[PDB]
Design an enzyme around this catalytic site. Sequence first.
Site, PDB file in Angstrom:
ATOM      1  N   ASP A  69       0.857  -1.174   0.000  1.00 39.71           N
ATOM      2  CA  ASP A  69       0.000   0.000   0.000  1.00 39.71           C
ATOM      3  C   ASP A  69       0.902   1.235   0.000  1.00 39.71           C
ATOM      4  O   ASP A  69       1.152   1.856   1.046  1.00 39.71           O
ATOM      5  CB  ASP A  69      -0.943  -0.051   1.206  1.00 39.71           C
ATOM      6  CG  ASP A  69      -2.004   1.006   1.174  1.00 39.71           C
ATOM      7  OD1 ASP A  69      -2.157   1.725   0.154  1.00 39.71           O
ATOM      8  OD2 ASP A  69      -2.746   1.127   2.187  1.00 39.71           O
ATOM      9  N   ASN A 115      11.421  -6.389  -8.301  1.00 41.31           N
ATOM     10  CA  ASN A 115      10.737  -5.142  -8.639  1.00 41.31           C
ATOM     11  C   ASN A 115      11.717  -3.998  -8.830  1.00 41.31           C
ATOM     12  O   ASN A 115      12.748  -3.909  -8.125  1.00 41.31           O
ATOM     13  CB  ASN A 115       9.678  -4.801  -7.582  1.00 41.31           C
ATOM     14  CG  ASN A 115      10.246  -4.012  -6.409  1.00 41.31           C
ATOM     15  OD1 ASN A 115      10.338  -2.763  -6.466  1.00 41.31           O
ATOM     16  ND2 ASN A 115      10.692  -4.724  -5.383  1.00 41.31           N
ATOM     17  N   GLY A 118      10.704   2.072  -8.534  1.00 43.93           N
ATOM     18  CA  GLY A 118      11.326   3.384  -8.556  1.00 43.93           C
ATOM     19  C   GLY A 118      10.561   4.460  -7.795  1.00 43.93           C
ATOM     20  O   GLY A 118      10.555   5.617  -8.214  1.00 43.93           O
ATOM     21  N   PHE A 119       9.953   4.095  -6.661  1.00 42.49           N
ATOM     22  CA  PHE A 119       9.242   5.055  -5.784  1.00 42.49           C
ATOM     23  C   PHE A 119       8.122   5.785  -6.535  1.00 42.49           C
ATOM     24  O   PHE A 119       8.024   7.010  -6.491  1.00 42.49           O
ATOM     25  CB  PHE A 119      10.191   6.107  -5.123  1.00 42.49           C
ATOM     26  CG  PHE A 119      11.041   5.638  -3.949  1.00 42.49           C
ATOM     27  CD1 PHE A 119      10.724   4.571  -3.122  1.00 42.49           C
ATOM     28  CD2 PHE A 119      12.143   6.442  -3.589  1.00 42.49           C
ATOM     29  CE1 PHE A 119      11.534   4.245  -2.041  1.00 42.49           C
ATOM     30  CE2 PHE A 119      12.942   6.142  -2.487  1.00 42.49           C
ATOM     31  CZ  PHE A 119      12.643   5.015  -1.726  1.00 42.49           C
ATOM     32  N   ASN A 182      13.769   5.299   4.719  1.00 43.66           N
ATOM     33  CA  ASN A 182      14.136   4.306   3.783  1.00 43.66           C
ATOM     34  C   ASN A 182      15.318   4.840   3.024  1.00 43.66           C
ATOM     35  O   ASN A 182      15.154   5.669   2.110  1.00 43.66           O
ATOM     36  CB  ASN A 182      12.959   4.004   2.834  1.00 43.66           C
ATOM     37  CG  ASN A 182      13.264   2.859   1.885  1.00 43.66           C
ATOM     38  OD1 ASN A 182      14.250   2.197   2.043  1.00 43.66           O
ATOM     39  ND2 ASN A 182      12.436   2.669   0.880  1.00 43.66           N
ATOM     40  N   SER A 184      17.376   2.440   1.688  1.00 48.67           N
ATOM     41  CA  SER A 184      17.789   1.120   1.177  1.00 48.67           C
ATOM     42  C   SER A 184      17.081   0.624  -0.079  1.00 48.67           C
ATOM     43  O   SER A 184      17.279  -0.537  -0.449  1.00 48.67           O
ATOM     44  CB  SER A 184      17.675   0.091   2.314  1.00 48.67           C
ATOM     45  OG  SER A 184      16.387   0.000   2.825  1.00 48.67           O
ATOM     46  N   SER A 185      16.235   1.454  -0.723  1.00 47.24           N
ATOM     47  CA  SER A 185      15.722   1.092  -2.042  1.00 47.24           C
ATOM     48  C   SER A 185      16.873   0.871  -3.018  1.00 47.24           C
ATOM     49  O   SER A 185      17.715   1.761  -3.164  1.00 47.24           O
ATOM     50  CB  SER A 185      14.815   2.149  -2.653  1.00 47.24           C
ATOM     51  OG  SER A 185      14.338   1.683  -3.909  1.00 47.24           O
ATOM     52  N   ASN A 187      16.359   0.952  -6.185  1.00 45.54           N
ATOM     53  CA  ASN A 187      15.779   1.477  -7.435  1.00 45.54           C
ATOM     54  C   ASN A 187      15.741   2.996  -7.590  1.00 45.54           C
ATOM     55  O   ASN A 187      15.103   3.496  -8.530  1.00 45.54           O
ATOM     56  CB  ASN A 187      14.375   0.882  -7.572  1.00 45.54           C
ATOM     57  CG  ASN A 187      14.410  -0.633  -7.539  1.00 45.54           C
ATOM     58  OD1 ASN A 187      15.286  -1.246  -8.174  1.00 45.54           O
ATOM     59  ND2 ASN A 187      13.500  -1.247  -6.803  1.00 45.54           N
ATOM     60  N   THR A 188      16.455   3.711  -6.708  1.00 43.44           N
ATOM     61  CA  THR A 188      16.685   5.163  -6.839  1.00 43.44           C
ATOM     62  C   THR A 188      18.198   5.379  -6.731  1.00 43.44           C
ATOM     63  O   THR A 188      18.804   4.970  -5.731  1.00 43.44           O
ATOM     64  CB  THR A 188      15.901   5.953  -5.765  1.00 43.44           C
ATOM     65  OG1 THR A 188      14.500   5.732  -5.964  1.00 43.44           O
ATOM     66  CG2 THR A 188      16.165   7.472  -5.839  1.00 43.44           C
ATOM     67  N   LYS A 225      15.417   1.826   7.722  1.00 45.94           N
ATOM     68  CA  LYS A 225      15.305   0.567   6.992  1.00 45.94           C
ATOM     69  C   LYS A 225      16.564   0.371   6.167  1.00 45.94           C
ATOM     70  O   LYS A 225      16.913   1.232   5.349  1.00 45.94           O
ATOM     71  CB  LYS A 225      14.085   0.552   6.082  1.00 45.94           C
ATOM     72  CG  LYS A 225      13.811  -0.805   5.446  1.00 45.94           C
ATOM     73  CD  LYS A 225      12.406  -0.878   4.896  1.00 45.94           C
ATOM     74  CE  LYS A 225      12.174  -2.173   4.132  1.00 45.94           C
ATOM     75  NZ  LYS A 225      10.777  -2.209   3.630  1.00 45.94           N
ATOM     76  N   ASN A 254      15.333  -4.475   3.543  1.00 39.76           N
ATOM     77  CA  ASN A 254      14.762  -4.208   2.221  1.00 39.76           C
ATOM     78  C   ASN A 254      15.093  -5.407   1.286  1.00 39.76           C
ATOM     79  O   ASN A 254      15.679  -6.431   1.700  1.00 39.76           O
ATOM     80  CB  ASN A 254      15.332  -2.888   1.661  1.00 39.76           C
ATOM     81  CG  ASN A 254      14.317  -2.121   0.841  1.00 39.76           C
ATOM     82  OD1 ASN A 254      13.670  -2.708  -0.060  1.00 39.76           O
ATOM     83  ND2 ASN A 254      14.125  -0.828   1.147  1.00 39.76           N
TER      84      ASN A 254
HETATM   85  C1  LIG Z   1       6.725  -4.879  -5.400  1.00 42.11           C
HETATM   86  C2  LIG Z   1       7.494  -4.429  -4.182  1.00 42.11           C
HETATM   87  C3  LIG Z   1       7.500  -3.068  -3.836  1.00 42.11           C
HETATM   88  C4  LIG Z   1       8.199  -2.596  -2.710  1.00 42.11           C
HETATM   89  N1  LIG Z   1       8.217  -1.264  -2.387  1.00 42.11           N
HETATM   90  C5  LIG Z   1       8.832  -0.812  -1.249  1.00 42.11           C
HETATM   91  C6  LIG Z   1       8.851   0.614  -0.837  1.00 42.11           C
HETATM   92  O1  LIG Z   1       8.226   1.459  -1.518  1.00 42.11           O
HETATM   93  N2  LIG Z   1       9.514   0.973   0.288  1.00 42.11           N
HETATM   94  C7  LIG Z   1      10.185   0.089   1.060  1.00 42.11           C
HETATM   95  O2  LIG Z   1      10.807   0.442   2.090  1.00 42.11           O
HETATM   96  N3  LIG Z   1      10.222  -1.232   0.748  1.00 42.11           N
HETATM   97  C8  LIG Z   1       9.590  -1.733  -0.353  1.00 42.11           C
HETATM   98  N4  LIG Z   1       9.614  -3.101  -0.675  1.00 42.11           N
HETATM   99  C9  LIG Z   1      10.366  -3.996   0.203  1.00 42.11           C
HETATM  100  C10 LIG Z   1       9.506  -4.722   1.214  1.00 42.11           C
HETATM  101  O3  LIG Z   1       8.980  -3.759   2.128  1.00 42.11           O
HETATM  102  C11 LIG Z   1      10.340  -5.746   1.979  1.00 42.11           C
HETATM  103  O4  LIG Z   1      11.420  -5.081   2.667  1.00 42.11           O
HETATM  104  C12 LIG Z   1      10.971  -6.829   1.077  1.00 42.11           C
HETATM  105  O5  LIG Z   1      10.148  -7.152  -0.051  1.00 42.11           O
HETATM  106  C13 LIG Z   1      11.263  -8.102   1.836  1.00 42.11           C
HETATM  107  O6  LIG Z   1      10.086  -8.726   2.321  1.00 42.11           O
HETATM  108  P1  LIG Z   1       9.352  -9.969   1.590  1.00 42.11           P
HETATM  109  O7  LIG Z   1      10.438 -10.952   1.196  1.00 42.11           O
HETATM  110  O8  LIG Z   1       8.387 -10.485   2.610  1.00 42.11           O
HETATM  111  O9  LIG Z   1       8.645  -9.342   0.402  1.00 42.11           O
HETATM  112  C14 LIG Z   1       8.919  -3.576  -1.832  1.00 42.11           C
HETATM  113  C15 LIG Z   1       8.882  -4.932  -2.202  1.00 42.11           C
HETATM  114  C16 LIG Z   1       8.217  -5.401  -3.325  1.00 42.11           C
HETATM  115  C17 LIG Z   1       8.252  -6.887  -3.602  1.00 42.11           C
HETATM  116  O1  LIG Z   2       9.773   1.579  -5.217  1.00 42.27           O
HETATM  117  C1  LIG Z   2      10.616   0.667  -5.301  1.00 42.27           C
HETATM  118  O2  LIG Z   2      11.161   0.348  -6.382  1.00 42.27           O
HETATM  119  C2  LIG Z   2      11.166  -0.044  -4.127  1.00 42.27           C
HETATM  120  C3  LIG Z   2      11.517   0.659  -2.989  1.00 42.27           C
HETATM  121  C4  LIG Z   2      12.110  -0.056  -1.940  1.00 42.27           C
HETATM  122  O3  LIG Z   2      12.456   0.501  -0.888  1.00 42.27           O
HETATM  123  N1  LIG Z   2      12.337  -1.375  -2.092  1.00 42.27           N
HETATM  124  C5  LIG Z   2      11.997  -2.028  -3.217  1.00 42.27           C
HETATM  125  O4  LIG Z   2      12.220  -3.253  -3.336  1.00 42.27           O
HETATM  126  N2  LIG Z   2      11.432  -1.364  -4.229  1.00 42.27           N
END
Ligand SMILES: Cc1cc2nc3c(=O)[nH]c(=O)nc-3n(C[C@H](O)[C@H](O)[C@H](O)COP(=O)(O)O)c2cc1C
Ligand SMILES: O=C(O)c1cc(=O)[nH]c(=O)[nH]1
Length: 366
Positions: A69, A115, A118-119, A182, A184-185, A187-188, A225, A254
């Site tokens: 979300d 994924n 890219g925020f 955050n 640790s993305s 993708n930025t 994070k 992350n």
């Molecule tokens: C499609 C997708 C989008 C994500 N977007 C974000 C994000 O916007 N910000 C963030 O801190 N982590 C993001 N994550 C990371 C998750 O919060 C989590 O740290 C990571 O996927 C590991 O958990 P999991 O193996 O249960 O998915 C994203 C992960 C996925 C798969």
């Molecule tokens: O928006 C994303 O691409 C994204 C952000 C993030 O913190 N982690 C991730 O896996 N994707």
Amino acid sequence: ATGDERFYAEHLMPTLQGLLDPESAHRLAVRFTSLGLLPRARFQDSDMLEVRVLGHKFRNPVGIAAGFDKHGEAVDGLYKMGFGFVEIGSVTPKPQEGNPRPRVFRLPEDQAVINRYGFNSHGLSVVEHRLRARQQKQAKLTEDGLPLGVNLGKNKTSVDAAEDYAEGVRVLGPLADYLVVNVSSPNTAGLRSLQGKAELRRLLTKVLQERDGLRRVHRPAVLVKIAPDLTSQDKEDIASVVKELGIDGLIVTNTTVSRPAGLQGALRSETGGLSGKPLRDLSTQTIREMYALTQGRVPIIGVGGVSSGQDALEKIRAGASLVQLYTALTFWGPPVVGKVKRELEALLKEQGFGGVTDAIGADHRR
Ligand SMILES: Cc1cc2nc3c(=O)[nH]c(=O)nc-3n(C[C@H](O)[C@H](O)[C@H](O)COP(=O)(O)O)c2cc1C
Ligand SMILES: O=C(O)c1cc(=O)[nH]c(=O)[nH]1
Ligand SMILES: CONC(=O)c1c(C)c(-c2ccc(-c3ccccc3F)cc2)nc2ccc(F)cc12
């Protein structure tokens, strides 16, 4: 296991994946969840799942990770699914589109996803108004043990990362039980370099000053994070900064930019962050290291590859006070939440723990 768990796992979720690309499926999931169009959560939280941490009661320790979300559209539906806490975001200051499509890739043979969103974000103003519309509903939810986290990102084109995070603190901090910086993305560009010592201290000082400037009743906890791909030096620097500044907690981890040997998915070489089963143990080990480096004094939210009670309990025993999942929901659907909770309760009893609290960091005391 329930009939719903098997129906979702063996029929409904595979059918949705056959019909829809992953981003379309994500969008449908958010829509359905936002409307409460969910299977019955056939599980009542017991007292042994309650955790008190970060200045809050958590009815259970299983949260929805950031990125599901992103824009705060489905918060109430996520609590209805059985999550003990919800983290929205990442939210950027200005709206932005994210990367071009396709940007989400399934690795079915690995129970993983890659994924590169890219925020993509509706931006702080839109999310602020959306949270304000339900702010008193959330106040009652938080009081009843269901807190809300807000994960803050930065815009692609911003010249000053610290100011982006500061703007987030000012705007969404008053609406959150905790905030997540955050850094640790994958993708930025240049974002993960904010985890280095000199930049992190300066960044986090500004964040904490902004947070401390909010009125007492609207003052959130601040968590950092971190990536699973950090050097030993990076981790020892982050721990040091966290303790020096009094950061409230860590989210560990992350997604990974690594591609572990053994990935079978045809899309394994796609650019992005890898999540799900192949991340699980790298993540657990990162929790273990961060717990030790912070002497067990800094609450950790453990995340990466949780899809069973065993996975949850391993992270708890490694040092996590709370866990999150995301990728597991994408394969097994809403029934996975109850499954994890039911299995975790059973394993706690089997291993002689009175509740979740007694198990936190238990591996370090062996
Ligand atoms: C499609 C997708 C989008 C994500 N977007 C974000 C994000 O916007 N910000 C963030 O801190 N982590 C993001 N994550 C990371 C998750 O919060 C989590 O740290 C990571 O996927 C590991 O958990 P999991 O193996 O249960 O998915 C994203 C992960 C996925 C798969
Ligand atoms: O928006 C994303 O691409 C994204 C952000 C993030 O913190 N982690 C991730 O896996 N994707
Ligand atoms: C690996 O293949 N997986 C996906 O492609 C995928 C799915 C199926 C889903 C999803 C769809 C539907 C429900 C649901 C079903 C019934 C009631 C409510 C729901 F939310 C849940 C989750 N969400 C995602 C979010 C991100 C992502 F990257 C991929 C996905």
